[PDB]
Design a protein around this nucleic acid. Structure first.
Ligand SMILES: [Ca+2]
Ligand SMILES: [Ca+2]
Length: 1203
RNA sequence: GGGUCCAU
RNA sequence: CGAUGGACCCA
């Protein structure tokens, strides 16, 4: 308390400089009211210039247009909140007119007449505002598009109206074209990227003209892309700008486009390890019924809401208790989640998307500077987003003398609150220091508490999610005999007690009914507790009167609505969303609870375009009702993909596209493309010839041709693709060929598993003198396994892993394969497995019923090569339902060892290392799962596993040959665990060969049969695999080639050399579009055709029906039509700002389903779920509907991006 | 429920 | 009258 207080406000509310920066500029001016101003003048630039240490990342970009002089300014600050201020507008708006009138295309000239004022702000504000770049465009007719204030473009043209340069300014604002004409490139960038990326596949072998032609035709792209001309138009992506710009009386002279903060690095702004790094430096001197209240700190980027957020974590572990970068701390009764609102629109992305909103805000200002000019933007990020209540912590008060000064700061930050209809007068304000709290000063520590216990009394208890009215997202309807109508869904809020009246409201005239009951897969509880996955039973209502989407709420709770007001964010390009902006006519589907729904929208007053990244407010009207109320999140999806999220603000009042086009493809599709000869065999022969390689002369050669393993990769890439392309072909005419070769083989497996099941139960050679590498690895192996696995299979596991999928069983068949048919029909069951089946029967009230009980499985024939079929077993159903328990847990466990069976990727990623480092090897085994004898399986597994494993397996089988066998192998492929087992047996077996050879076990990675282990192991792993039964396939195990292959990918020294096969005789136009696409993928290098093969492609393209030669698709979208450029595609009907292309699809007729089976499969699955960008939590899994494939094809219109 | 690739 | 798992594509 030094000089005066009252007439210091006068010093503040004159310049607007920090408070103490005022009482102390009077603490050096004897009390001179007008001197005070000057001393702060020439003392503010020491501020602003030791301010340059704060990066200027955010800001605004300005544009002005006079007759035909335009200028695009790009002054910027360092915060959303400044860049939208009242004051930051004044400056960078007036500086924009100093470039207009006086045309100042020079940047230094204006960063000079203003540097006086460029501190009359920073002093008042507190962010490094550096006026960045200026420059202007002289045009004869030019226009500008202004996108928020974030991205600005300037396009001067000629002969074009406003309705042109607007658009072509909007194209420039949504397609960052760094050039104006395809022929604008300097032979630097062009002989950079053309004599750099010439060796690229010139080293790949590909000879001169090829790499020459590819590279070149690639730069034809590397240019058209970045250039206004060959750049698909943005408001009509069919024609490029250069073909729109020509169709009119116009031509772009040039364009300038600035984006608020490009080039500027801006290094990440974490929080936890930011706060924790503050908290763990001043650390140096039963009850889950606790609510979770989300709070965020919001304030000025330097009043240390980072410190004040540390004081609430320290002082709160020093006393009481103890998404995406939020810091939790605990309180005697509640549980908090603290954010830091660091950017206005950077936050609305969060509350909207649903990430983490705020149940209560906390405004950190420092009493040293008072409220800030951009404080209001903070408080206006308040009103504008919902945050219920706002708490105000006044930081750094010791640094203030006179107390009447403080009661003047409040004075202000109460009167800003109440310009934003927040309760200003009745809002709480704590005065205290953050840094001192850390230090340890308890006269201050009680303030960080005085605040904490304000969060304990001003932000009220959030309404328990199980306490609000009833509501439950109906996701599937069933008509069971004796239950009538039942819906199943995860009850979202409230309780439904059996007997109560629920009202089914949503899509049609809302209906009434009454709760007959509620059941899970096991219990039958008389109520539904929100958060549970139950089915709820209804009386007196037909099942064609409900649909997915509707909810089942207590009556009056929620009403159907069609039009409303919202705020939605649009998934940026890199977040897997759209990548072309859209405009006035967006027409998507809106995913609500369990169903899409189409709907049109209207942008607000003045916005005309919208783009990836934007988060626009918009009014939406749907094609028909949903049950909706304020605070209901919804995704925005376009055929499959999620491209935007968003919530509902207020719920309003409310009450080309050709066909005999689609018609023409339907028919062409069903054409049987016809030609003489083995088509395929021609495509192959012609393809070989295209690469100076001699074709097959008989189809007899097609698969008796062995590659050469030495040659330039190109000389080999082509060659492997020769030895493999026609290797799986079925329609192979001549050839004394059969599936009975397949059995013969299958029939050896046994003889082998005898030979080895027998002498593997005889670990007594003769003596004790000598020792065997085999007998040893089993001993290591066995132990290792037991530590990974256990005594026996867990039941908290055997439970969370036993499911019912796949097609056929000894009692079902492809026709009735889908799970609900397994729950409907009485499934088989092996004798030994009977005890489990009942265990289940005792676990549920549903009729787990076992049909015929037997020890047999059916051994059959799925096709494999051109010279042999595969030998399978259709298990008895109920065995399978359990075989999947231990197949499943064997998975989860095989994870510790490093093996991930859910990802053929880690295992083919390495296949590639191998081929380059020549250290890893890849090993193939022959009849993989067929040689695992019980012997080797017994002395290797725990005896509790080895039973639960004997129990569930099929011990006998019946062949088509009429006869039987008594499996010598522990398990046939077909078996439910046979995979995760061979994985584990193989893996362990190799890991042991690792230890005995002193090699880092962890270098062994296995996938069923595909083992990859350190190359030294391969002779031992081979001598072992010998001894223990398996037979190690020389011709397809590599430990030295330039070549490895693993999990479908092959490789020749870093280069991919994975071929493709033309498995069956090609007759359908679908069947062609495949080979043709597979071809395309195998010789494209990111769009550019290797020419050699582009030859044989085009030639065969011509075999296809006219319309279909021209109907093309982006890659990664199937084979319902030739992969090509989707813009060219003519039957590409654009609709509602979302492209739609037509793809062929195998035709289907709806079929009857079993209402129990599915109802049981749905509840049972819901039980399964319970013992097992960031907004895909608005996406469930869909109902059960069945259909048999017909012989026909059908044209399906699907959604689409621009690449 | 239908695909393509893929390990058995 | 086509087993079991991946991984993605439609639905
Ligand atoms: Ca293999
Ligand atoms: Ca094999």
């Amino acid at each position: 308390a030094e000089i005066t207080a009252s007439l210091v406000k006068e010093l503040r509310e004159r310049t607007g400089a920090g408070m103490m920066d005022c009482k102390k500029a009077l603490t050096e001016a004897n009390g001179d009211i007008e001197l005070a101003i000057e001393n702060m003048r020439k003392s503010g630039a020491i501020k602003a210039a030791k301010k340059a240490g704060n990066v200027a990342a955010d800001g605004v970009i300005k544009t002005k247009i006079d007759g035909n002089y335009g200028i695009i300014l790009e002054v910027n600050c360092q915060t959303d909140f400044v860049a939208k201020d009242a004051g930051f507008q004044a400056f960078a708006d007036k500086v924009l007119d100093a470039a207009v009138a006086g045309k100042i295309t020079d940047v230094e000239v204006l960063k000079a007449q203003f540097e006086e004022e460029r501190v009359a702000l920073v002093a008042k504000i507190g962010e490094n505002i550096n006026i960045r770049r200026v420059a202007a465009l002289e045009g004869d007719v030019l226009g500008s598009y202004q996108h928020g204030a974030r991205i600005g473009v300037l396009v001067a043209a000629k002969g074009a109206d406003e309705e042109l340069v607007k658009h072509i300014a909007m194209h420039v604002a949504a397609s960052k074209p760094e050039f104006i004409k395809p022929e604008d490139v300097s032979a630097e960038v062009v002989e950079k990227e053309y004599q750099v990326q010439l060796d690229i596949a010139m080293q790949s072998g590909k000879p001169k003209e090829i790499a020459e032609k590819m590279v070149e035709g690639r730069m034809k792209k590397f240019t058209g892309e970045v250039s206004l001309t060959g750049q698909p138009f943005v408001m009509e992506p069919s024609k490029t700008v250069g073909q729109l710009l020509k169709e009119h009386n116009a031509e772009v002279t040039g364009f300038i486009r600035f984006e608020v903060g490009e080039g500027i690095e801006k290094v990440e702004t974490d929080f936890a390890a930011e706060v924790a790094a503050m908290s763990k430096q001043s650390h140096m001197s039963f009850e889950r019924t606790k609510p979770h209240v989300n709070v965020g700190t919001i304030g000025h980027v330097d009043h240390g809401k980072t410190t004040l957020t540390a004081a609430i974590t320290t002082v709160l572990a020093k006393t009481y208790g103890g998404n995406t970068s939020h810091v939790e701390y605990d309180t005697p009764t509640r549980h908090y989640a603290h954010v830091d609102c660091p950017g206005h629109a950077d936050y609305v992305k969060n509350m909207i998307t649903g990430a983490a909103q705020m149940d209560g805000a906390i405004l950190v200002v420092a009493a040293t500077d008072g409220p800030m000019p951009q404080t209001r933007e903070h408080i206006l990020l308040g009103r504008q987003v919902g945050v219920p209540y706002i708490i105000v912590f006044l930081n750094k008060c010791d640094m203030v003398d006179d107390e009447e000064l403080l009661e003047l700061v409040e004075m202000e930050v109460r009167e800003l609150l109440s310009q934003y209809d927040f309760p200003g007068d009745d809002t709480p304000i704590v005065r205290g220091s953050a840094l001192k709290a850390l230090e340890g000063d308890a006269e201050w520590e009680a303030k960080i508490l005085e605040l904490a216990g304000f969060l304990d009394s001003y932000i009220p208890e959030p309404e328990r999610a199980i306490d609000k009215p009833f509501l439950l997202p109906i996701e599937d309807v069933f008509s069971i005999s004796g239950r009538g109508t039942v819906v199943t869904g995860r009850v979202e809020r409230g309780i439904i007690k059996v007997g109560e009246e629920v009202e089914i409201v949503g899509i049609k005239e809302t209906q009434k009914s009454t709760c007959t009951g509620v059941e899970m897969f096991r219990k039958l509880l008389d109520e539904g507790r929100a958060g549970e996955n139950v089915g709820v039973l209804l009386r007196g209502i037909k099942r064609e009167e409900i649909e997915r989407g509707q909810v089942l709420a207590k009556p009056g709770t929620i009403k159907p609505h069609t039009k409303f007001e919202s705020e939605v964010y649009i998934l940026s390009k890199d977040e897997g969303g759209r990548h072309t902006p859209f405009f006035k006519g967006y027409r998507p589907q809106f995913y609500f609870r369990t169903t899409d729904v189409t709907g049109t929208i209207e942008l607000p007053e003045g916005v005309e375009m919208v783009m990836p990244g934007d988060n626009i407010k918009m009014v939406v009207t749907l094609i028909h009702p949903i049950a909706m109320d304020d605070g209901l999140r919804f995704a925005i999806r376009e055929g499959g993909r999620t491209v935007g999220a968003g919530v509902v603000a207020k719920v309003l009042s409310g009450a080309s596209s050709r066909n005999s086009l689609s018609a023409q493809l339907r028919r062409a599709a069903n054409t049987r493309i016809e030609v003489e000869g083995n088509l395929a065999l021609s495509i192959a022969n012609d393809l070989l010839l295209a690469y100076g390689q001699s074709p097959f002369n008989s189809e007899a050669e097609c698969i008796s041709f062995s590659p050469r393993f030495d040659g330039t990769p190109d000389d080999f890439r082509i060659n492997y693709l020769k030895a493999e392309i026609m290797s799986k072909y079925d329609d192979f005419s001549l050839g004394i060929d059969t599936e009975a070769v397949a059995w013969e083989k299958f029939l050896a497996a046994e003889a082998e598993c005898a030979l080895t099941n027998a002498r593997l139960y005889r670990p007594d050679y003769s003596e004790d003198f000598n020792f065997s590498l085999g007998e040893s690895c089993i001993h290591m192996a066995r132990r290792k396994i037991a530590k990974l696995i256990g005594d026996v299979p867990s039941v908290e596991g055997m439970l969370r892993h036993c499911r019912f999928s796949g097609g056929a069983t000894t009692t079902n068949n492809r026709s009735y394969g889908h799970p609900s048919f397994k729950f409907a029909l009485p499934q088989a069951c092996t004798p030994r497995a009977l005890k489990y089946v009942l265990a289940l029967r005792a676990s549920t009230h549903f009729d787990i019923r076992i049909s015929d009980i037997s020890p047999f499985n059916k051994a059959v024939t799925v096709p494999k090569n051109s010279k042999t079929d595969r030998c399978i077993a259709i298990e008895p159903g109920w065995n399978m339902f359990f075989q999947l328990g231990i197949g499943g847990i064997l998975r989860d466990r095989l994870r510790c060892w490093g093996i991930d069976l859910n990802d053929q990727t880690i295992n083919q990623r390495r296949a590639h290392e191998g081929s380059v480092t020549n250290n890893l090897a890849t090993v193939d085994l022959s009849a993989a799962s067929d040689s695992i004898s019980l012997a080797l399986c017994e002395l290797l597994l725990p005896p509790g596993w080895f039973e639960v494993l004997m129990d569930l397996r099929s011990p006998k089988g019946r062949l088509p040959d009429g006869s039987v066998v008594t499996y010598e192998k522990i398990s046939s492929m077909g078996n439910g665990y046979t995979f995760e087992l061979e994985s584990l047996i193989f893996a362990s077996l190799a890991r042991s060969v690792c230890e005995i050879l002193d090699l880092d076990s962890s270098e062994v990675t296995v996938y069923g049969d595909d083992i990859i282990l350190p190359s030294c192991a391969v002779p031992a792993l081979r001598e072992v695999f010998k001894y223990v039964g398996f037979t190690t396939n020389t011709k397809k195990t590599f430990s030295e080639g330039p070549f490895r292959e693993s999990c479908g990918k092959h490789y020749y020294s870093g280069v991919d050399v994975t071929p493709f096969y033309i498995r069956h005789r090609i007759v359908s136009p679908a069947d062609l579009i495949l080979v043709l696409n597979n071809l395309y993928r195998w010789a494209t290098i990111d769009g550019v055709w290797d020419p050699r093969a582009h030859s044989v492609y085009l030639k065969y393209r011509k075999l296809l029906p006219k319309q279909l030669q021209r109907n093309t698709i982006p890659d990664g979208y199937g084979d319902g039509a030739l992969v090509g450029s989707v813009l060219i595609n003519p039957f590409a009907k654009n609709r509602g700002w979302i492209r739609y292309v037509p793809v062929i699809t195998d035709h289907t007729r709806d079929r009857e389903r079993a209402e129990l089976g599915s109802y049981l499969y749905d509840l049972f699955s819901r039980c399964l779920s319970e013992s097992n960008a960031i907004d895909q939590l608005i996406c469930r899994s869909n109902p059960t509907k069945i259909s048999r494939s017909t012989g026909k094809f059908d044209i399906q219109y699907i959604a689409c991006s621009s690449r």
